[PDB]
Write a protein that binds this ligand. Structure first.
Ligand code: VR9
Ligand code: MG
Lengths: 408, 543
């Protein structure tokens, strides 16, 4: 097979990202995987004249998968895979009643990679205690995790999927990186059947697939809810006013002055102030503006998507995806339902992966996360529960939120 | 000498040409010793003699019982492609395993022993002047890794690594560490076998053109390596010497705090808090700084623990790994890494760049990262905190946080949380409506409160900030309140600081507030929008 030549964006030099140190268990796993892959031609050992590098990790069933972090190499070759070989994003995938996600990364491993490009796929298995230099490979085939791989392979993919698409003209199929998202409006049971058909169909054409049932019907901007309560106190009014004031930054039509007049005299926090009709109308008038959605809230595809996550306690995390402040394109919640089985970093990591999967389905792009975690902590334990082939970009927040209940 | 090793191909940075540098003639006596050495390594194939056909050139110098040849390759180095980065960092003695024997081998004339890629040799050319300087010049190039060239360390490394592979396979019981131009070979074979294998290695290497020290010249332990003392069953930092001077320069303080941290991998308890507070003052380069009083006590304490010599053991992977953490004070922590109780693998300190517990978490991170680097696993931790304390703090903290398997150790100063704020306002507690302020330019301020019972105060303030008074307001309500108080403030800044449950600070205000909050029995702190018109009439009085 001929190799699609890959030029970089001019004036860009290849990735030079230092490799994290790894537990001995994971180094051993990586050495195993790579000895096999070198044996199958998929990668080759390289010398010191190759100065580039790209981190590698080991993640997981009961077997170790290698996971290469091509985040830098992707930005450095963005034209190739977004402009030149772009894969268009189906605006109807988000509207399907069901979306299964199929791992098809194994298709790449047969297709050769351009001989002049391989140098930039270098990676290193590190050593413990710096006892040896490090084992250096570079890829000879399209690598999993690179955004060029799927772009290069979409020709072959469009052909392999043609008979299925003709037979099932209502099923939507989108390819992000190493995964196909297939949506249908079928009964859960029909859907799982149609999916085994596609699995069998892909298998009839030499594509292996191993062995998440998402539902983008309940996927919107969730509405901010005032606490309903039978009785109200000086303090309650005070939390209530504070919540409403902050929302003013989002719906400037929050009319609350009949509440500020409510308790005008310095009163104890426990004083159970009663309800004014003039005040109560400013509360129902405001709960209505809360039911409606925002104005101006549109997806600008020239810009980047931003996700903010807040820990809420008791295993509950809230998130907002936006592009400009206060103009939320989507908000939501996550909850890990296994106590004495789940811990904070597991939750943040599962949260991060659900938000990304959502974002791929709705927009075909990933957000940059604002994570509420210490940088060094996260750089140490994310692989322990990472189950995805892509890696979104991130940065860390050190300023806490003012009122976490402001989002739930 | 130049070896039958296969050369690593090298090319110049894209769209660059080789150096064409100027060669101003030099001492006639120099030009003599140069050719005496220059044609003595030509006969060894390290260099050759080329005509003016090649246009590139580089300058050459002399230095000194003999002389020595030098080539500043700075102009070429800027022009040759980048390579793989020669390993950054060093193996820590804490992470070596006890081997019955360890031989050190340093390769002679390493870079000159490795061929340089043929089609890149033109770019190494130089000219030796003809004294008369109008007389013609003799032109040489290199056939081997030139001294101090950009590619040399990294190509040398990969040649050595390759040459090792055939021997590493025949002898899987021995262990070669590589470091720059040295080989460190351990083994658990009876000293006769090990000495036989060392000679097998030397001969191997010699046939690849790498000379190496005979048994007579093989260094003997303890080993003086990278500022360590490597005894066959123990390691320590080399002798560390702290000067007793009267005056102290910026540089003198830099060199001292360095020799101290260095010592802290293995000497427990060392502190650098006050010593470094001084340099943090300004970026002065050689200004003299008066030794402060507290710093002086620190240096005295450091000098005491340094008076006696301390040692560490090496790693045994069958025996698990433990890390123990002590709090020292003013945001200073110490920890030890060991496998059995009477010798440590290594020691160290963490410092605050905050809550006592948060810092502990950050220290467990620092250690965790270091363990992974040095041994490939994480320690089990012995920690001075009650499990119930930890579970309470993390469940309520806004960051996610991870705590590898750990155990409580009832060795004070234990780590505790000192107060907690009420989740909901207190019935039967006076409610205080505090506020504060100041003027940017004027620098005067006012702080006060107004309670529901009708009580009111205002205090004038000099040399204060809108933020420093908003905390003064809160301190007023705590000074003048019963054991249960509701406070209400329009300052997120002040709410933030208090909610952070800080354990101490440099800000003495905040320390007083802390001693109040620990004194109080129930405090509920609550926030309202500023300038909204609800009980905030207290801002008028402070205004
Ligand atoms: C004195 C030695 C000793 O007896 N022990 C038990 C420590 C283990 O050191 C090695 C273990 C193995 Cl497996 C192989 C080689 C070892 O030597 C070194 C390892 C790292 C750095 N080095 C720098 C020098 C000097 N100069 C020597 C060593
Ligand atoms: Mg790597």
């Amino acid at each position: 097979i001929e190799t699609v030549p890959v030029k970089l964006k001019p004036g860009m030099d290849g990735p030079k990202v230092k490799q994290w140190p790894l537990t001995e268990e994971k180094i051993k796993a990586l050495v195993e995987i790579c000895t096999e892959m070198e044996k199958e031609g998929k990668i080759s050992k390289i010398g010191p004249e190759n100065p580039y590098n790209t981190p590698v990790f080991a993640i997981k069933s009961t077997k170790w998968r290698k996971l290469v972090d091509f985040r830098e190499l992707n930005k450095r070759t963005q034209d190739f895979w977004e402009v030149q070989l772009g894969i268009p994003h189906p605006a109807g995938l988000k509207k399907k009643k069901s979306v299964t996600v199929l791992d098809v990364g194994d298709a790449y491993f047969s297709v050769p990679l351009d001989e002049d490009f391989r140098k930039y796929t270098a990676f290193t298995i590190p050593s413990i205690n710096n006892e040896t230099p490090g084992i250096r490979y570079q890829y000879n085939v399209l690598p999993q995790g690179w955004k060029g791989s799927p772009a290069i392979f979409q020709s072959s993919m469009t052909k392999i999927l043609e008979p299925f698409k003709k037979q099932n003209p209502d099923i939507v199929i989108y390819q992000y990186m190493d995964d196909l998202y297939v949506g249908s409006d079928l009964e859960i049971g029909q859907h799982r059947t149609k999916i085994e058909e596609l699995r069998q169909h892909l298998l009839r054409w030499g594509l292996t697939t191993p062995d998440y049932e998402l539902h983008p019907d309940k996927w919107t901007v969730q509405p901010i809810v005032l606490p309903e309560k039978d009785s109200w106190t000086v303090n309650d009014i005070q939390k209530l006013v504070g919540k409403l004031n902050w929302a003013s930054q989002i719906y400037p039509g929050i009319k609350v002055r009949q509440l500020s007049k409510l308790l005008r005299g310095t009163k104890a926090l426990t004083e159970v102030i009663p309800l004014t009709e003039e005040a109560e109308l400013e509360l129902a008038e405001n709960r209505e503006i809360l039911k409606e959605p925002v104005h101006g809230v549109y997806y600008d595809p020239s810009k980047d998507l931003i996700a903010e996550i807040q820990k809420q306690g008791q295993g509950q995390w809230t998130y907002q995806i936006y592009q400009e402040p206060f103009k939320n394109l989507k908000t939501g919640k996550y909850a890990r339902m296994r106590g004495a089985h789940t811990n904070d970093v597991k939750q943040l990591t599962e949260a991060v992966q659900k938000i990304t999967t959502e974002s791929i389905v709705i927009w075909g792009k990933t957000p940059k996360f604002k994570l509420p975690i210490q940088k060094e902590t996260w750089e140490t334990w994310w692989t322990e529960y990472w189950q995805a082939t892509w890696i979104p970009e991130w940065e860390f927040v050190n300023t806490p939120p003012l009122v976490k209940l402001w989002y739930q | 000498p130049i070896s039958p090793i296969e050369t690593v191909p090298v090319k110049l940075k894209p769209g660059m040409d080789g150096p064409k540098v100027k060669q101003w003639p030099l001492t006639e006596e120099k030009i003599k010793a140069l050719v005496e050495i220059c044609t003595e390594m030509e006969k060894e194939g390290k260099i050759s003699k080329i005509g003016p056909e090649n246009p590139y050139n580089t300058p050459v110098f002399a230095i000194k019982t003999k002389w020595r040849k030098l080539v500043d390759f700075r102009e070429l180095n800027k022009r040759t492609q980048d390579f793989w980065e020669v390993q950054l960092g060093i193996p820590h003695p804490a992470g070596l395993k006890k081997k019955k024997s360890v031989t050190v081998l340093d390769v002679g004339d390493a870079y000159f022993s490795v061929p340089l890629d043929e089609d890149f040799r033109k770019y190494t050319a130089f000219t030796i002047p003809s004294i008369n300087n109008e007389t013609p010049g003799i032109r040489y190039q290199y056939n081997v890794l030139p001294q101090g060239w950009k590619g040399s360390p990294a190509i040398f490394q990969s040649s050595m690594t390759k040459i090792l592979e055939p021997f590493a396979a025949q002898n899987p019981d021995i262990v070669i560490y590589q470091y720059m131009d040295d080989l460190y070979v351990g083994s658990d074979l009876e000293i006769g076998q090990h000495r036989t294998k060392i000679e097998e290695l030397r001969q191997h290497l010699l046939r690849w053109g790498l000379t190496t020290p005979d048994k007579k010249h093989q260094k003997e332990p303890p080993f003086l390596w990278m500022g360590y003392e490597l005894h066959p069953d123990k390691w320590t930092v080399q002798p560390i010497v702290l000067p007793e001077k009267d005056s102290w320069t910026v540089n003198d303080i830099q060199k001292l705090v360095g020799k101290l941290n260095w010592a802290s991998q293995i000497y427990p308890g060392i502190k650098v808090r006050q010593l470094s507070k001084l340099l943090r003052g300004t970026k002065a380069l050689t200004e003299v700084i008066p030794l402060t009083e507290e710093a002086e006590l620190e240096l005295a304490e450091n000098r005491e623990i340094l008076k006696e010599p301390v040692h560490g053991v090496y790693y045994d992977p069958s025996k698990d790994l433990i890390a123990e953490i002590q709090k020292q004070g003013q945001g200073q922590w110490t920890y030890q890494i060991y496998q059995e109780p009477f010798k440590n693998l290594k020691t160290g300190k963490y410092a605050r760049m905050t809550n006592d517990v948060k810092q502990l978490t950050e220290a467990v991170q620092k250690i965790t990262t270091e363990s992974i680097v040095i041994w490939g696993k994480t320690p089990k931790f012995k920690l001075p905190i009650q499990k119930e304390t930890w579970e309470t703090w993390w469940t309520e903290y806004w960051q996610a946080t991870w705590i590898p398997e750990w155990e409580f150790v009832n060795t004070p100063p234990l780590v505790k949380l000192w107060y907690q704020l009420e989740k909901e306002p207190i019935v039967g507690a006076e409610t205080f409506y505090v506020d504060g302020a100041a003027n940017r330019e004027t620098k005067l301020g006012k702080a006060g409160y107004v309670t529901n019972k009708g009580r009111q105060k205002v205090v004038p303030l000099t040399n204060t900030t809108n933020q420093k008074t908003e905390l003064q307001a809160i301190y007023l309500a705590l000074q003048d309140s019963g054991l249960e108080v509701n406070i209400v403030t329009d300052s997120q800044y002040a709410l933030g600081i208090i909610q952070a449950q800080p354990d101490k600070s440099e800000s003495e205000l905040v320390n007083q507030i802390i001693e109040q909050l620990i004194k109080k029995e129930k405090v509920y702190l609550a926030w309202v929008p500023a300038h909204k018109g609800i009980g905030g009439n207290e801002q008028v009085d402070k205004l």
